[PDB]
Scaffold this active site. Structure first.
Site, PDB file in Angstrom:
ATOM      1  N   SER A  24       0.948  -1.028  -0.093  1.00  0.00           N
ATOM      2  CA  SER A  24      -0.213   0.168  -0.219  1.00  0.00           C
ATOM      3  C   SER A  24       0.894   1.346  -0.109  1.00  0.00           C
ATOM      4  O   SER A  24       1.425   1.704  -1.276  1.00  0.00           O
ATOM      5  CB  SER A  24      -0.775  -0.066   1.400  1.00  0.00           C
ATOM      6  N   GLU A  32      -9.245  -4.072  -3.919  1.00  0.00           N
ATOM      7  CA  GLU A  32      -8.418  -2.807  -3.818  1.00  0.00           C
ATOM      8  C   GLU A  32      -9.533  -1.562  -3.233  1.00  0.00           C
ATOM      9  O   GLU A  32      -8.843  -1.351  -2.260  1.00  0.00           O
ATOM     10  CB  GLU A  32      -7.533  -1.748  -4.592  1.00  0.00           C
ATOM     11  N   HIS A  39      -7.506  -5.616  -0.026  1.00  0.00           N
ATOM     12  CA  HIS A  39      -6.161  -4.921  -0.052  1.00  0.00           C
ATOM     13  C   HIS A  39      -5.721  -5.256   1.974  1.00  0.00           C
ATOM     14  O   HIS A  39      -6.492  -5.014   2.366  1.00  0.00           O
ATOM     15  CB  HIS A  39      -6.124  -3.787  -0.675  1.00  0.00           C
TER      16      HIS A  39
HETATM   17  P1  LIG Z   1      -2.834   2.215   2.136  1.00  0.00           P
HETATM   18  O1  LIG Z   1      -1.512   2.202   2.730  1.00  0.00           O
HETATM   19  O2  LIG Z   1      -3.436   1.383   2.738  1.00  0.00           O
HETATM   20  C1  LIG Z   1      -3.451   1.698   4.584  1.00  0.00           C
HETATM   21  C2  LIG Z   1      -5.048   2.223   4.554  1.00  0.00           C
HETATM   22  N1  LIG Z   1      -2.653   3.123   0.937  1.00  0.00           N
HETATM   23  C3  LIG Z   1      -3.603   2.783  -0.040  1.00  0.00           C
HETATM   24  C4  LIG Z   1      -3.623   3.560   1.091  1.00  0.00           C
END
Ligand SMILES: *[P@](=O)(OCC)N(C)C
Ligand SMILES: O/N=C/c1nc(CCCCNc2c3c(nc4ccccc24)CCCC3)ccc1O
Ligand SMILES: *[C@@H]1O[C@H](CO)[C@@H](O)[C@H](O)[C@H]1NC(C)=O
Ligand SMILES: *[C@@H]1O[C@H](CO)[C@@H](O)[C@H](O)[C@H]1NC(C)=O
Ligand SMILES: *[C@@H]1O[C@H](CO)[C@@H](O)[C@H](O)[C@H]1NC(C)=O
Ligand SMILES: *[C@@H]1O[C@H](CO)[C@@H](O)[C@H](O)[C@H]1NC(C)=O
Ligand SMILES: *[C@@H]1O[C@H](CO)[C@@H](O)[C@H](O)[C@H]1NC(C)=O
Ligand SMILES: *[P@](=O)(OCC)N(C)C
Ligand SMILES: [Cl-]
Ligand SMILES: [Cl-]
Ligand SMILES: [Cl-]
Ligand SMILES: [Cl-]
Ligand SMILES: [Cl-]
Ligand SMILES: [Cl-]
Ligand SMILES: [Cl-]
Ligand SMILES: [Cl-]
Ligand code: NA
Lengths: 528, 532
Positions: free
Chosen positions: B197, B324, B437
């Site tokens: 992420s 996602e 995700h």
């Molecule tokens: P990631 O860090 O998901 C955790 C909230 N990002 C895609 C925002």
């Protein structure tokens, strides 16, 4: 006598015509307006001054001066649309087919030919009413109107050439039927105007124009729509095309009166030879002289007339063929050939899209490109061909017409939508052209009923269903007699396939792309 | 002893922990920088001053100060991502798992957690390196960095609050691994960084950052990439938030010095309490304090760097999961519910499109709407709920990453791209959410090998083929073993664009992943908005 009928302009005498082991009466080449010649070229038509004697009305009239297609000399599939009689400017005549014995007050259908307001004849073989009149016991009229600069040169502010004058020829023929069809056993109170392509658009424009509403009862529009983009120009544009056609034959330009003087002295083919040199964008898909939004044949913009409901509220039956785009790529695009399968390379496809939407800025092109491409397989010659064919069909016919039926159906008293998708068994064009526009007419006019024409049993069967659909619609406002064709409603949008197979109902004709064409792309280009 | 290790900053005492009917060596909570506290809040890390005595590295460190998700209290699906140790600005520590017996010169993998740059911990059950370090014989490191304002409050021009200090934390932790991992049997010449992420976007940002390129060798990016829309802000925009964060705290804003003095007196939660109020829009999938395009950590725009080839050339392995987007609609979009199939009405659909594309004019949102709608059937909740999920996933993760993979592969020395599409058989989130995700992560870390966590046997196999693909990539730069006859994961090439599935059924090789929407997201809509 059956063929001795006296009209309000003088008497006419027809001819007994054979039809499928029987006979009907034909009245061919009746003049409904004084020849538009000399001082009267580009002019509003004036009605046929009444004649003494009997009018030999036994042979087809002349055809209006028009471009003649020679892309394929001697090819039957393109020659069937060329003028088959001598061309003259003295060309305002109509043709009537009357069942024998002569009916007493029966349904009349009036046919309006297409051909893009640059071409068209009442006297083609496919427009021969002897089969539809006979088999459905209706009185069939086919009119004529001037095409090209002879019919749609527009210099708004001038009364010597105001424009829309070829729409006025059709209304004068319509008025003539309103005045004289009672005598031929027609019912003037139930006239049904119908036409294809530019015929379709004309039928729609008489629904819109107040001067035409009361001269017919309902309307059938095949593959044509008054709001189609090729069907009208603004006032300024139709001027500049007149002005430039003047300069493209070296005429006086400081005004109008002289530029129109210079154009009535020129021979007919002189303007036809230079006809196309006035088109703004390369485009290929436009036509030089077409109806103008003049503010009086059409009181306002069409969209405002349809949102406001300023048109005739009646019944309409309308539809499209599957592949309205084939003909126009074949004659004017890259890699389209009437002999290969016409598989389209990506870069040729890009070219089509820019041709296909005359006007689009760079962003509007990338929009249209993205909506018709499959990017897992974008070098597929076939679906690039088929994709661009759809672009033309969707943009120039199918979606302009769905727009029309949706706005109309809020206000009308009935709507019937068809989707014609049978390729004829005896078609002479390549398969990749699919269900070419214009090739529903053969069935409307019942030619598959003629055994020597080598149509199949199921196409003879399909023809009679369509003529009855068209005829029953013309008599009753609805194509069915109490399997039934559903009405198209504002909220469910149902239509039917027309083909050799049992009728089947669908909803929302090509909605995904017509959302794109009628809502999203307009808002993209107005933005930038 | 195996557990006493003498580093360049001091000695550390670790602990022998068990794993899978055996044992591994662990070094937990080792500090790599001075505690970013007091007047060092918002400033760059400074390296840990070296200590006398033996540092007790037997227990997990604190977690950095961060917002705490509490929509579903008690609910394991959400609390598994909440901090599980005390929070504290004193949080810049890192953990090492070392096989036993200790290797000689072995591959090193360094994990960077996601959490939107506003949250995350090195110490979560799902990031336990004990199974991975153990079954692939790599030396596993997880690091830490300050999140939210503490990490990314950016007043460009100031040296007291420059921005990106959260990124610089991870670089100094990697500098630490460069200088000491050899003392634990780790090859500082064969370090693979990886993260999920916002962790994936940081991995990508170290591929781009000049001061970072030399501290690792290959890279791995999961459901994240530097260029993503939620991952960077401009100098001007990071400033107006910083200022606005002070306005929300009744600070003096006549000057940075005064504004940072004011911000440094307030207590951590007091910032965390207002950190969302500085967002420019009602958003889903947007966070307040993120890396900044400053001109130091990032010399130029992420785009121009990608086009000029101004990044580290190596092998990247990278990919995304199917759904996602479903997490963020659950928490931030109308009509979505944790205990419901969440059929989305058209009205709620339109609203979701505006929340997903905060930044577009209405020509923009008509475009997005037109392109994710079936107009034969526009009021079918499932098609609308699913379409919105694809919008969020594509705009924010899928397509920004497929842009990155495309640009990088031109210059890189090899790319392997995966589409992860296994909903674990024991997920606690409803089915409509699909493969959320984050839920690749337990397979990468090999939790399906633990029997009392109750995975499908074929989920253990899938977790083992992945760890293998990943450690084998980390060692050799190629997820495959030559010699072997298991079916081979092909290279993504500039274009035949091969990629693979990751699930329990045998491996399929696909091409061109979500081209159609990514042509829309990466190429058309940006054009539409520059003109409008
Ligand atoms: P990631 O860090 O998901 C955790 C909230 N990002 C895609 C925002
Ligand atoms: O599509 N045509 C393609 C096309 N053909 C020709 C054939 C000779 C003149 C026909 N003049 C026609 C024109 C155009 N369109 C036509 C459509 C049907 C029949 C004749 C046409 C548009 C551009 C100007 C002339 C020339 C140029 C063309 O670009
Ligand atoms: C009318 O013209 C046709 C065609 O030339 C001819 O055969 C016919 O005999 C004519 N009729 C009269 C009454 O002259
Ligand atoms: C048509 O009009 C008649 C009378 O004005 C009305 O009763 C009827 O319901 C209408 N039908 C349709 C299909 O609009
Ligand atoms: C490290 O700390 C834990 C608890 O804080 C303690 O139980 C352990 O004994 C300590 N180790 C050493 C070597 O002091
Ligand atoms: C990687 O680099 C080596 C040496 O420069 C080269 O031989 C090889 O082909 C490259 N592979 C890729 C996928 O770029
Ligand atoms: C795993 O499954 C067993 C059933 O054999 C059950 O007793 C145990 O509580 C389960 N554990 C978890 C964490 O679900
Ligand atoms: P129509 O009249 O077809 C003739 C070529 N129209 C689509 C222009
Ligand atoms: Cl016959
Ligand atoms: Cl004159
Ligand atoms: Cl009226
Ligand atoms: Cl068929
Ligand atoms: Cl609709
Ligand atoms: Cl265990
Ligand atoms: Cl300021
Ligand atoms: Cl390549
Ligand atoms: Na200042």
């Amino acid at each position: 006598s059956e063929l001795l009928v006296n009209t309000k302009s003088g008497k006419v005498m027809g001819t007994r015509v054979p039809v499928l082991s029987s006979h009907i009466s034909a009245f061919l080449g009746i003049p409904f307006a004084e020849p538009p010649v000399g001082n009267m070229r580009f002019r509003r038509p004036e009605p046929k001054k009444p004649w003494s004697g009997v009018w030999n009305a036994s042979t087809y009239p002349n055809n209006c001066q028009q471009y003649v297609d020679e892309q394929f000399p001697g090819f039957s599939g393109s020659e069937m649309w060329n003028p088959n009689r001598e061309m003259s400017e003295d060309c305002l005549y109509l043709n009537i087919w009357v069942p024998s014995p002569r009916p007493k007050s029966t349904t009349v259908m009036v046919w309006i030919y297409g051909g893009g307001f640059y071409s068209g004849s009442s006297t083609l073989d496919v427009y021969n009413g002897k089969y539809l009149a006979y088999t459905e016991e209706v009185v069939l009229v086919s009119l004529s109107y001037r095409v090209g600069a002879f019919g749609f040169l527009a210099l708004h502010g001038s009364q010597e050439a105001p424009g829309n004058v070829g729409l006025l020829d059709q209304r004068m023929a319509l008025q003539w039927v309103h005045d004289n069809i009672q005598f031929f056993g027609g019912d003037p109170k139930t006239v049904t105007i119908f036409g294809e392509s530019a015929g379709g658009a004309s039928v729609g424009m008489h629904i819109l124009s107040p001067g035409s509403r009361d001269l017919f009862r309902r309307a059938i529009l095949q593959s044509g729509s008054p709001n189609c983009p090729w069907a009208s120009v603004s006032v300024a544009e139709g001027r500049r095309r007149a002005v430039e056609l003047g300069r493209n034959l070296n005429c006086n330009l400081n005004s109008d009166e002289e530029l129109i003087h210079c154009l009535r002295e020129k021979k007919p083919q002189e303007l036809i030879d230079v006809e196309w040199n006035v088109l703004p964008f390369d485009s290929i898909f436009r036509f030089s002289f077409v109806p103008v939004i003049d503010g009086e044949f059409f009181p306002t913009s069409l969209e405002s007339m349809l949102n406001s409901g300023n048109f005739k509220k009646t019944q309409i039956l309308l539809g499209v063929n599957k592949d309205e785009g084939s003909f126009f790529l074949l004659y004017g695009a890259p890699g389209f050939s009437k002999d290969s399968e016409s598989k389209i390379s990506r870069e040729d496809f890009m070219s089509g899209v820019k041709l296909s939407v005359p006007h689009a800025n760079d962003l509007g092109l990338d929009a249209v490109t993205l909506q018709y491409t499959d990017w897992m397989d974008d070098n597929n010659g076939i679906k690039n061909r088929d994709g661009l064919d759809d672009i033309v069909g969707d943009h120039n016919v199918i979606c302009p017409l769905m727009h029309f039926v949706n706005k109309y159906t809020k206000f009308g008293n009935g709507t019937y939508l068809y989707f014609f998708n049978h390729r004829a068994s005896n078609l002479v064009w390549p398969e990749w052209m699919g269900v070419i526009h214009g090739y529903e007419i053969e069935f409307v006019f019942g030619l598959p009923l003629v055994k020597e024409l080598n149509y199949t049993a199921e196409e003879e069967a399909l023809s009679r269903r369509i003529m009855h659909y068209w005829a029953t619609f013309a008599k009753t406002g609805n194509p069915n007699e109490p399997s039934k064709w559903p009405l198209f409603t504002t909220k469910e949008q149902k239509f039917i396939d027309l083909n050799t197979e049992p009728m089947k109902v669908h909803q929302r004709l090509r909605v995904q792309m017509c959302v794109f064409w009628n809502q999203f792309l307009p808002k993209l280009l107005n933005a930038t």
